[PDB]
Amino acid sequence: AVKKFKPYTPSRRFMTVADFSEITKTEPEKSLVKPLKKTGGRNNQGRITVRFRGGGHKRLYRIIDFKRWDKVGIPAKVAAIEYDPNRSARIALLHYVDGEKRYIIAPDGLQVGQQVVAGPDAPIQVGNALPLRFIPVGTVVHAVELEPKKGAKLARAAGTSAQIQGREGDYVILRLPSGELRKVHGECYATVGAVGNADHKNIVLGKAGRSRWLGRRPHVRGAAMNPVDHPHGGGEGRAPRGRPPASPWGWQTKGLKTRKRRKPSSRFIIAR
Amino acid sequence: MKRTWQPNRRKRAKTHGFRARMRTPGGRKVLKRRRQKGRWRLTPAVRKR
RNA sequence: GUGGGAGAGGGUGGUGGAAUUCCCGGAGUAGCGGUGAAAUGCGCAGAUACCGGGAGGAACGCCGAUGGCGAAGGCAGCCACCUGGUCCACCCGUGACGCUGAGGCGCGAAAGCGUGGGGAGCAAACCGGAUUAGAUACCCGGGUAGUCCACGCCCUAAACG
RNA sequence: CCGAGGGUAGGGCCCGUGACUGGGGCGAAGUCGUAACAAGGUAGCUGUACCGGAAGGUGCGGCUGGA
RNA sequence: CGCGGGGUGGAGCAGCCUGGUAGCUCGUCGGGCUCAUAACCCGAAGGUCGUCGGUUCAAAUCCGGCCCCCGCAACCA
RNA sequence: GUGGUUCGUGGAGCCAUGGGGGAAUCUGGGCGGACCACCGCCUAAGGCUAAGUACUCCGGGUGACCGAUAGCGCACCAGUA
RNA sequence: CGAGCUAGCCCUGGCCAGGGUGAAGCUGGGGUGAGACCCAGUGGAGGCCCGAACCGGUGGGGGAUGCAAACCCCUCGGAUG
RNA sequence: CGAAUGCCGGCAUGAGUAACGAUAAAGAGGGUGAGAAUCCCUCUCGCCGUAAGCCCAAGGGUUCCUACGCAAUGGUCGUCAGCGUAGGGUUAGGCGGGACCUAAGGUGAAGCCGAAAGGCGUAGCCGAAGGGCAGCCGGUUAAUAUUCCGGCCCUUCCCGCAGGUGCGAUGGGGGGACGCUCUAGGCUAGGGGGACCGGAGCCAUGGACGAGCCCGGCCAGAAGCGCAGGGUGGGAGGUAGGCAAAUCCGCCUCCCAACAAGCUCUGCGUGGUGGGGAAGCCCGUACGGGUGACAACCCCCCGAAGCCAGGGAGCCAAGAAAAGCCUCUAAGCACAACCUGCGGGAACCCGUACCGCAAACCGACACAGGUGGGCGGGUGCAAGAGCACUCAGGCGCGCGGGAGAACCCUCGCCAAGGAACUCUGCAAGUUGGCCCCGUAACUUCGGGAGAAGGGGUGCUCCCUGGGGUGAUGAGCCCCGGGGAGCCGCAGUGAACAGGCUCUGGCGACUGUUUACCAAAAACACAGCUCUCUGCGAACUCGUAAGAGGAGGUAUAGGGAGCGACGCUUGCCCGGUGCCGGAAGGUCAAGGGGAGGGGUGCAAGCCCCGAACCGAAGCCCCGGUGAACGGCGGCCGUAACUAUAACGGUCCUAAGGUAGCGAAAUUCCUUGUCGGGUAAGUUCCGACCUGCACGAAAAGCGUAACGACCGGAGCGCUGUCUCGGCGAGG
RNA sequence: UCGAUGUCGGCUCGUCGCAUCCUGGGGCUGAAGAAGGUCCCAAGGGUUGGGCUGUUCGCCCAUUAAAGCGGCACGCGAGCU
Numbered sequence A: 001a002v003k004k005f006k007p008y009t010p011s012r013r014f015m016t017v018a019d020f021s022e023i024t025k026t027e028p029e030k031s032l033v034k035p036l037k038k039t040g041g042r043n044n045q046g047r048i049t050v051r052f053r054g055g056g057h058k059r060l061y062r063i064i065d066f067k068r069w070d071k072v073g074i075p076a077k078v079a080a081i082e083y084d085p086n087r088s089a090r091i092a093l094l095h096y097v098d099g100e101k102r103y104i105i106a107p108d109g110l111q112v113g114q115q116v117v118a119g120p121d122a123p124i125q126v127g128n129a130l131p132l133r134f135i136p137v138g139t140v141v142h143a144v145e146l147e148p149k150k151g152a153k154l155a156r157a158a159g160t161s162a163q164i165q166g167r168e169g170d171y172v173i174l175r176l177p178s179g180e181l182r183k184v185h186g187e188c189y190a191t192v193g194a195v196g197n198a199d200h201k202n203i204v205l206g207k208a209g210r211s212r213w214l215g216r217r218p219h220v221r222g223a224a225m226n227p228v229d230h231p232h233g234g235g236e237g238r239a240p241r242g243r244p245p246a247s248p249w250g251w252q253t254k255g256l257k258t259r260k261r262r263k264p265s266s267r268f269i270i271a272r
Numbered sequence B: 001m002k003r004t005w006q007p008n009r010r011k012r013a014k015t016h017g018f019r020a021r022m023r024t025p026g027g028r029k030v031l032k033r034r035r036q037k038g039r040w041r042l043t044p045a046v047r048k049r
Numbered sequence C: 001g002u003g004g005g006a007g008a009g010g011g012u013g014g015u016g017g018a019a020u021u022c023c024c025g026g027a028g029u030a031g032c033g034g035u036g037a038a039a040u041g042c043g044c045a046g047a048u049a050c051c052g053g054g055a056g057g058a059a060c061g062c063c064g065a066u067g068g069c070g071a072a073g074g075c076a077g078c079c080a081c082c083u084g085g086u087c088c089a090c091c092c093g094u095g096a097c098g099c100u101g102a103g104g105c106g107c108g109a110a111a112g113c114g115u116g117g118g119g120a121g122c123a124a125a126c127c128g129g130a131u132u133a134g135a136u137a138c139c140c141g142g143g144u145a146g147u148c149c150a151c152g153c154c155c156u157a158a159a160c161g
Numbered sequence D: 001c002c003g004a005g006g007g008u009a010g011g012g013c014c015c016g017u018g019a020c021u022g023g024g025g026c027g028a029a030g031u032c033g034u035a036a037c038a039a040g041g042u043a044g045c046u047g048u049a050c051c052g053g054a055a056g057g058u059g060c061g062g063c064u065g066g067a
Numbered sequence E: 001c002g003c004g005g006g007g008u009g010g011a012g013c014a015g016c017c018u019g020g021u022a023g024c025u026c027g028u029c030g031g032g033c034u035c036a037u038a039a040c041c042c043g044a045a046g047g048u049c050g051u052c053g054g055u056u057c058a059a060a061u062c063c064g065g066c067c068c069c070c071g072c073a074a075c076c077a
Numbered sequence F: 001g002u003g004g005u006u007c008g009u010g011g012a013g014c015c016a017u018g019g020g021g022g023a024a025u026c027u028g029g030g031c032g033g034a035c036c037a038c039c040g041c042c043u044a045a046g047g048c049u050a051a052g053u054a055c056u057c058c059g060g061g062u063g064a065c066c067g068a069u070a071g072c073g074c075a076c077c078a079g080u081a
Numbered sequence G: 001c002g003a004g005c006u007a008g009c010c011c012u013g014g015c016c017a018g019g020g021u022g023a024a025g026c027u028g029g030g031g032u033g034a035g036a037c038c039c040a041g042u043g044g045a046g047g048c049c050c051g052a053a054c055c056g057g058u059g060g061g062g063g064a065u066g067c068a069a070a071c072c073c074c075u076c077g078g079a080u081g
Numbered sequence H: 001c002g003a004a005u006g007c008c009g010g011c012a013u014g015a016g017u018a019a020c021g022a023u024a025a026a027g028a029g030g031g032u033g034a035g036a037a038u039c040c041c042u043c044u045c046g047c048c049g050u051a052a053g054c055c056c057a058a059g060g061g062u063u064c065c066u067a068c069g070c071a072a073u074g075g076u077c078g079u080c081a082g083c084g085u086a087g088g089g090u091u092a093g094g095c096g097g098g099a100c101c102u103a104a105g106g107u108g109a110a111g112c113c114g115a116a117a118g119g120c121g122u123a124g125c126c127g128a129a130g131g132g133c134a135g136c137c138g139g140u141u142a143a144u145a146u147u148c149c150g151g152c153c154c155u156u157c158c159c160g161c162a163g164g165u166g167c168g169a170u171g172g173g174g175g176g177a178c179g180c181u182c183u184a185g186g187c188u189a190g191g192g193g194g195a196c197c198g199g200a201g202c203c204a205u206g207g208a209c210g211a212g213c214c215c216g217g218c219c220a221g222a223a224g225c226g227c228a229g230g231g232u233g234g235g236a237g238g239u240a241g242g243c244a245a246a247u248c249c250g251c252c253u254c255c256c257a258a259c260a261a262g263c264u265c266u267g268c269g270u271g272g273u274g275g276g277g278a279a280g281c282c283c284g285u286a287c288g289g290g291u292g293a294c295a296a297c298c299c300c301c302c303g304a305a306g307c308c309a310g311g312g313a314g315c316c317a318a319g320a321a322a323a324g325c326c327u328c329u330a331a332g333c334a335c336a337a338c339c340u341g342c343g344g345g346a347a348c349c350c351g352u353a354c355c356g357c358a359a360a361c362c363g364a365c366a367c368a369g370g371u372g373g374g375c376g377g378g379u380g381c382a383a384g385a386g387c388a389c390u391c392a393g394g395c396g397c398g399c400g401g402g403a404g405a406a407c408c409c410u411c412g413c414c415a416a417g418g419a420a421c422u423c424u425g426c427a428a429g430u431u432g433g434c435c436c437c438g439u440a441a442c443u444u445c446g447g448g449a450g451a452a453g454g455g456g457u458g459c460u461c462c463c464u465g466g467g468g469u470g471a472u473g474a475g476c477c478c479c480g481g482g483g484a485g486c487c488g489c490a491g492u493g494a495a496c497a498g499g500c501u502c503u504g505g506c507g508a509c510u511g512u513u514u515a516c517c518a519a520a521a522a523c524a525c526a527g528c529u530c531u532c533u534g535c536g537a538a539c540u541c542g543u544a545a546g547a548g549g550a551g552g553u554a555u556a557g558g559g560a561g562c563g564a565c566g567c568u569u570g571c572c573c574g575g576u577g578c579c580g581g582a583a584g585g586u587c588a589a590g591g592g593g594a595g596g597g598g599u600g601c602a603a604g605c606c607c608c609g610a611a612c613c614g615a616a617g618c619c620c621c622g623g624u625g626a627a628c629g630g631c632g633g634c635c636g637u638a639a640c641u642a643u644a645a646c647g648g649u650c651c652u653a654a655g656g657u658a659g660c661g662a663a664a665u666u667c668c669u670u671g672u673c674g675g676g677u678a679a680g681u682u683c684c685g686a687c688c689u690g691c692a693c694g695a696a697a698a699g700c701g702u703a704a705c706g707a708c709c710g711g712a713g714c715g716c717u718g719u720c721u722c723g724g725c726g727a728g729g
Numbered sequence I: 001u002c003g004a005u006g007u008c009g010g011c012u013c014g015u016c017g018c019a020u021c022c023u024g025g026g027g028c029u030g031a032a033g034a035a036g037g038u039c040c041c042a043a044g045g046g047u048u049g050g051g052c053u054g055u056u057c058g059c060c061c062a063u064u065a066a067a068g069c070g071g072c073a074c075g076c077g078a079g080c081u
């Protein structure tokens, strides 16, 4: 989708909005299973650690279910599909037959009315979740766990997905939304299908405000400020850095790798 | 234009208050000295009810 | 109408083997590539040649034809779903309901453009090596768009019988 | 009231002119190369795209007006 | 005016700083191939080294004086 | 690897130690300025211990100390206005 | 010792007169094999417009032991973000 | 002590000078007094009036009221006062806050961390104009009142009887409970009208004894009705979720509802009853009292931003929590308890005066400044909180009087010319609101547009078309149309209310910034690109624990640059950086000890110490330019000259492509041509010899947008020729 | 003169020098006349308005009897810009 606009105001011409057709006549969220008071704040205890944040629409947290072995075997019916301000993926709310309700990040396909479930059993269909081993090599899938019982963590962004590649001992090779081939443990669930609402990468914010709404204040270039507060700074009419591009704190930012070398997680990785 | 003193009872006891100064090691010393110097008033005289 | 037949006609979903390039392991040495001839290039940091494993993209050998199909552009491994034209037989129905067609409308190779994806091989530009008086070329070694998919544009041709 | 015309204001079409610039035509014997016609010494022509003093080269698909 | 760089056969460049020995590409001349010209092949010629001085036995080469040439600075007022 | 002593790596001991290695109970151990022999001196890895010493919020005495711009910032209801 | 000024953010309340312009979306009609599309009517979008409050502080004039250690007069910027 | 712009105190000078704090404005009569421009009174005049009037909050803390008073305080005076002395004054179960709740954030048992101090910290607690909660209208004081008094109406606790039921928790669930913009229906506050009801009174100066003028025609009010409107399904079985248990909730499955029909629940009318009640006139105030009064206390109209509220529609940026309240069950307990109706009893702490857009607060001042919320009437101008006048109400701003010079400030007008002024039309003028005609290049189809340029606007009479509220009518109130006619120089007759255009530069744009000399071409901005980051992420803060990132997960997050959009972004990897290289060379501690030394009679003890084994880093081998950066010099050549497509040669890592170019880059420079001018060191268009452009420190363009900067024209003018007169301070 | 002598140009106001641009007097002239050239006396008075530049100065446009050169802190900011 992606709503468009006629130019009746510069900016609201290039501006592009999402299409909330996929939003089952829902909107008002569900008390109980979410929301919780969401403590918004751009800095830690005192100081500001991440810069340029703050401001932007008030938000309510939708406490989603990111570990599904909670209900192994208990099937549930997908009730609605709603908007979640805390993420890029739309989310689906679903009523188990157990009578319990919980939200799930909604996969592309999954339609309201559908029945979905989790566990070793589970049929390989959009929405169902199973330990990685039991999933057919090659099938795509989202909401992966990295270590058994620790909760989902990979491919949860709007319309992202990972593809299974092979098996190898108690591990199974994956291919993350980034292109890295990772070795994940067999016992990590991963609900099947891709995340959906993949038009998300196409929304043209539009104006200055639009960014402000999502809570992101203006970002000033180092080049603009002085030597006192950033490498690229001073002296006359602009300047060409004058040294290898660096961050406010001073480490190179055009090429310098960061992953800490001797990490134990190294051996389970294979790509880029 | 607007100036720098905008009186506020709450802020004043809340900041230069007595329990305020007792709470920290530096403030307790603030008291010591003032006590040791004589000062009729150890801390500002906030008021009302 | 009825009853049948051929076919790379079109779209969608899935799928198979060959081969190339790359990665990994084994094994293995003093050269491999390439050309009219050479060099550039690659190779004792373990190449080429051989075996085993994996990744990935694109095109379908033999059948294959001087063949078929489509209105044209064009269409080729295999499977299924949707769908267009067409031919024969039976001479049952309608009953002149026909032909062409300014404009319109739709389709339209390749290259090209927009957005996102993909990227093995190839390959404008581009960089080297040779060739020549000079080579912005023909030859060689590299290589980016593009070539691939989805959507939307572009409307060209020795779009030729 | 209308009203020739005069005034003011903004359009439309057409003609003349302009430093400078784009390509074109024409002009016996100036310069640079060899693109085409013979297999033209890289078969050629073509649509498009890029590049090059110049003819032109190359990529992609096409064409017999070549084999 | 000041700083440093440079004048070499016809053209463009080496040659010095560690003084004795001028080298390369083109061009020019003679000869070949071609019907002829170019290409290509075979041979040959050409340099008071910007000038006036001395430095040493000996100066393109070291050192000062001028003749042009090129580049850099001419700031605070 | 450092600190302490006069000792700033010095021929650098002795005394404390953060890190690594890691003993013995008198024929046992440390020390006398690297180290070794001799000759000597002490007896580590538990603790307590007056007096002699410092100070002057406070009381008292004395002044070749000041005398209200001096002397405490304040002789006076001053850490006040 | 200070964020009772100023800067940013966090929690929670408030304020923005009155006029303009008229997006989508619907509704009917037209169009077609189904469309795209085109009409009106409706609708009320927007870091949209005029303009107070309010938030500013453009240009000039005054003031310059000032009313004022930043002020006053005329003018001017934005004003549902 | 004579000096130190010395330190402290005192007193001179300028000097009876400058000032006396908004140009809103004063005059008079009568008081009191030792003394009046300045205090009290009356009359006239002026000023504010979306306040310069009322009502809260903050802050202030006696400033409030009254008697007695002027030394000082008051910019003068002062009998007055916000000043001096004294006395009086603030009354709450229902208003605000607390014996209630939570937010950010504080604190913090458990726990973690840190040399000490101290840092972190789920429970809990603190924490508020947010949630919760029961008083409305009049009367009284010199000063207080939703507080005292009167009328009416409520809330809790505690203890009873009456009677219903399984009651029952800090525990389960429900609810509380939510954004922005635009809105419907019915109401109220508020306001206009009245031939109608009620009133003291008034006929002025030429007319009027008249449906004449002037004044006023309400407030609160329990249940019930009535009118609006919000909430809400009711059954029965099954149950594996809601961390114990539930009959509750949730989720299945059948039934009747789909309606607000019915339950409740607010609002608003009416309501037993209670209260108020003008002008004028009489009085004595520093003010209030009395009469008008048995006051009347009615009918239409307009009408909210407020009320019904959890109303509805739409949109994306997706919009607190906890308690009260309902329900559910657990331990316990069912002679308890709890629910409902009637009683009586109990109902505490603090705040209450006064100032409050200002002389009582922040600015050292009775300071032309700064200060949050509610009410803010009428008439007219299209509207409105705008503007002019003006109710209520409050002011004339705490030195006056004369004078009528220069000059200054603020304002008004001007012959003829009109930008000649000047760095610059700086300034000031022209223009101006509504309605109707009518509008170009260009363009991103929106715009450009209020383009440009025009005509209308008052009053009178006639005819006439819609609504709205009333019944389908009169009235009242809104919007229209046609036709005649009247007066001025002039009809948004006053006040508020764009000058216009053409053309370049820069930045896309609305925004932002040097509080107190710079608002811009600078910052930001959507968007593009590069690079990091697999999640105990990267990055940042922190010694740490820990937190932010993020309760996010590559369509995500950090960093860098560029900066809408269009067309594009060429070559150089030699140096620097970064990325990739289980080979080499070096490379520290450590391992190793060939070998040598010092002492001992010696075993031994203690030193040096070569091979060799040794990381990261550098070196080396490759890559990488939307990484740091860089992107040539000299000669010759065409059949008039001329120039050079063409050639030679030198060096480089490679030798600036496109596009632009005397530029925001051009030194020589007022380059040289062309354009505007009578004249043009600027400006616009060209050429290219680019001192010293050039492609993401982007290149060249670009509609729209601008308190940006340059050039021109039209209009208009005191800017000027060139001044003159008048006004007030 | 740095315990401060405000500094280019313009504007307002001037004032002085003569090495005179104009007007008056005069000699030589290759001075027929008219008009010039050059020089001597002479400073009493006069010495225009615009276009461009911050400009001084200059170049132009239209004139004029002429469109004079210089000084006074490159006259004059407790006079202005």
Ligand SMILES: NC[C@@H]1O[C@H](O[C@H]2[C@@H](O)[C@H](O[C@@H]3[C@@H](O)[C@H](N)C[C@H](N)[C@H]3O[C@H]3O[C@H](CO)[C@@H](O)[C@H](O)[C@H]3N)O[C@@H]2CO)[C@H](N)[C@@H](O)[C@@H]1O
Pocket (backbone or CB within 6 Å): D027, D030
């Ligand atoms: N008519 C020829 C048109 O112009 C071009 O041709 C033009 C040129 O290429 C051509 O130039 C030629 C040159 O090619 C050739 N190699 C040398 C010759 N001297 C030149 O000649 C030219 O100049 C000379 C003297 O001035 C004249 O007398 C003669 O007419 C003229 N053609 O002269 C032509 C104009 O006259 C295109 N090549 C041709 O295809 C096109 O159709």
Ligand SMILES: [Mg+2]
Pocket (backbone or CB within 6 Å): A031, A032, A035, A036
């Ligand atoms: Mg909640």
Ligand SMILES: [Mg+2]
Pocket (backbone or CB within 6 Å): A044, A045, A046, A047, H541
């Ligand atoms: Mg911190």
Ligand SMILES: [Mg+2]
Pocket (backbone or CB within 6 Å): none
């Ligand atoms: Mg803290």
Ligand SMILES: [Mg+2]
Pocket (backbone or CB within 6 Å): A202
């Ligand atoms: Mg995109």
Ligand SMILES: [Mg+2]
Pocket (backbone or CB within 6 Å): A219, A220, A221
């Ligand atoms: Mg930025």
Ligand SMILES: [Mg+2]
Pocket (backbone or CB within 6 Å): A224, A225, A226, A234
């Ligand atoms: Mg800066």
Ligand SMILES: [Mg+2]
Pocket (backbone or CB within 6 Å): A227, A228, A230, A231
């Ligand atoms: Mg720095």
Ligand SMILES: [Mg+2]
Pocket (backbone or CB within 6 Å): A231, A232, A233, A234, A235, A239, A240, A241, A242
């Ligand atoms: Mg820099």
Ligand SMILES: [Mg+2]
Pocket (backbone or CB within 6 Å): A236, A237
């Ligand atoms: Mg610069």
Ligand SMILES: [Mg+2]
Pocket (backbone or CB within 6 Å): none
């Ligand atoms: Mg530089």
Ligand SMILES: [Mg+2]
Pocket (backbone or CB within 6 Å): none
């Ligand atoms: Mg028949």
Ligand SMILES: [Mg+2]
Pocket (backbone or CB within 6 Å): C101
């Ligand atoms: Mg036909």
Ligand SMILES: [Mg+2]
Pocket (backbone or CB within 6 Å): C108
């Ligand atoms: Mg096509």
Ligand SMILES: [Mg+2]
Pocket (backbone or CB within 6 Å): none
């Ligand atoms: Mg194609």
Ligand SMILES: [Mg+2]
Pocket (backbone or CB within 6 Å): none
């Ligand atoms: Mg290739």
